[PDB]
């Protein structure tokens, strides 16, 4: 569309966009075959395979780390360095916080980005690349993925059969949950509709939200918008994820 020519325009930056009315089939779609960094929308991904490894009470398995365990971000682990915290703990540290800490140890209990990428694999996910812990230039493929890529993904896990219901129930109210992004593909979405999403935020202003959108009534639309800009330590706008979302919406409603 001419409005996310527009939007890339207006924010001097680089848009991918992906959305898939699962009542429909019908697509809205924009570079959505482009590769940007994952960022933290990976967490989600992570934690889904995380589910289908673990039975739900496996998840309160106590796991203890370290103050070496601790990287640039750890909302919820900085405060458990002496007790500890279970994986149902740090998934919910994880999806709702961002909590960088708390993705490094659930990818460590799950065998490492070599791991990750061998059960994202097993789903169907060719493109999703992930290669390092954390993670997180132009044009590298690390550690990368695809708007296409990652609603497919996200939907596989939180609403077709790469998860049985109980598991899929507690993935979706995490990123229902979710702290970190009122100001994105929320602030795009009508009044009353739930959301549930995950964030992610890198360099070369990259600018992340993969997200499940109920309508009132009807069958859930999955929407990634996926952004980037010219320079390295280039800033980033939250209001551009807005906007874009809501291009989506007007172009499927
Ligand atoms: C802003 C932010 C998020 C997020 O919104 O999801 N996620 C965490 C992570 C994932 O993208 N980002 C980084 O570790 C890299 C950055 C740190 C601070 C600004 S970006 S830390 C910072």
Redesign the pocket.
């Given at each position: 569309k001419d409005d996310f020519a527009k939007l890339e325009e207006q924010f001097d930056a680089k848009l991918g966009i992906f959305a898939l009315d699962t009542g429909t089939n019908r697509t809205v779609a924009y570079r959505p075959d482009e590769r940007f960094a994952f960022?933290?929308?990976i967490?989600a991904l992570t934690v889904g395979v995380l589910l289908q490894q673990k039975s739900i009470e496996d998840l309160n398995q106590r796991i203890t780390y370290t103050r070496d365990d601790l990287?640039?971000?750890n909302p919820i682990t900085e405060k458990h360095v002496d007790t500890g915290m279970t994986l149902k703990e740090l998934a919910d540290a994880s999806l709702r916080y961002?909590d960088?800490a708390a993705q490094n140890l659930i990818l460590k209990q799950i065998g490492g980005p070599e791991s990750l990428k061998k059960e994202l694999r097993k789903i169907g996910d060719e493109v999703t690349n992930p290669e390092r812990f954390?993670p997180?230039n132009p044009g590298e493929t690390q550690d990368t993925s695809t708007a296409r890529a990652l609603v497919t993904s996200l939907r596989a896990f939180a609403l077709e059969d790469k998860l049985p219901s109980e598991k899929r129930e507690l993935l979706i109210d995490w990123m229902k949950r979710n702290t970190?992004?009122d100001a994105l593909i929320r602030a795009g979405v009508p009044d009353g509709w739930e959301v549930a999403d995950?964030?992610?935020?890198?360099?070369y202003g990259?600018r992340?939200d993969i997200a499940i959108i109920w309508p009132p009534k009807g069958d859930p639309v999955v929407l990634a918008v996926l952004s980037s800009r010219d320079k390295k330590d280039a800033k980033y706008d939250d209001k551009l994820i807005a906007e874009a979302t809501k291009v989506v919406m007007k172009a499927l409603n």
């Open positions: 960022a933290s929308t967490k990287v640039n971000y961002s960088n954390c997180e970190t992004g995950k964030t992610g935020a890198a360099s990259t992340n």
